[PDB]
Amino acid sequence: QMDMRCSASVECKQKCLKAIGSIFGKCMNKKCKC
């Protein structure tokens, strides 16, 4: 699992943490956004 396809069950943390520094990302851009 975890296949960087907006459903990796984890991008909603790291991507958001790289975005604004949050662990509450939203399924977007093959990952998640804040």
Side-chain angles (χ1 to χ4, degrees), residues 1-31:
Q1 300 186 211
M2 299 79 183
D3 196 60
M4 57 174 182
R5 57 175 56 236
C6 195
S7 303
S9 305
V10 64
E11 330 91 288
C12 306
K13 313 279 180 62
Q14 279 65 89
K15 226 297 182 179
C16 206
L17 257 169
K18 302 172 184 297
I20 67 173
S22 186
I23 59 173
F24 310 91
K26 299 295 182 61
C27 171
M28 284 297 177
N29 298 329
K30 292 301 181 184
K31 293 298 186 59

